[PDB]
Amino acid sequence: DNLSRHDMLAWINESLQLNLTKIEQLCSGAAYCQFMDMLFPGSIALKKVKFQAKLEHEYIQNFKILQAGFKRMGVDKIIPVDKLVKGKFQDNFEFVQWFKKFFDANYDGKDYDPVAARQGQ
C-alpha cells in the first residue's frame, strides 16, 4: 500500500508547506523533525534543527534530534540514519513510506502552522 513518489511529495509539501522536488531531499531529516513537532508539540528540539541543511553533518544532527524525539515519545523505530543521509532514493523512499503510516496513525487533529514553526529560530 505504498504511495507513489509523486503522491508522497504532495503530502509532504502540503502538510508542512515545503518545496521538495525529490524524495531524496528527505535525507536532511528536517521534514521528519517538523512532522514530529506537529504530532507531539515539545517532543523535538526545534531550535536546533537546520531547516535548509546542505551538508551531511547537518543531516546527521537533524536525525539525532528526531531519534531523541522518538525515544521521548516511546516510538519503536531504529532510524537507519547512516543510510538515509547519503541521499539515495531507495532507502529514503522505504523510510518515508513507514513514516507516513506512523504519522497517519498518530495524527489527532491538532492545529499546526508549519511555516510559523520555522520562524523566530
DSSP string, 24-72: GGGGGSHHHHHHHHHHSTTSS-GGG--TT--SHHHHHHHHHHHHHHHHH
Query: What letter does residue 2 receive in the DSSP assignment?
Result: P
What are phi and psi for residue 91, nearest 5 degrees? Answer: -65, -40
All domains of the chain in start order, with CATH: 1-121 (1.10.418.10)
Specified resolution (Å): 1.2
What's the Cα-to-Cα distance from 68 to each of 1, 3, 29, 57, rounded to whole Å?
Answer: 28, 27, 13, 17
32/3 Cα distance (integer angstroms)? 17
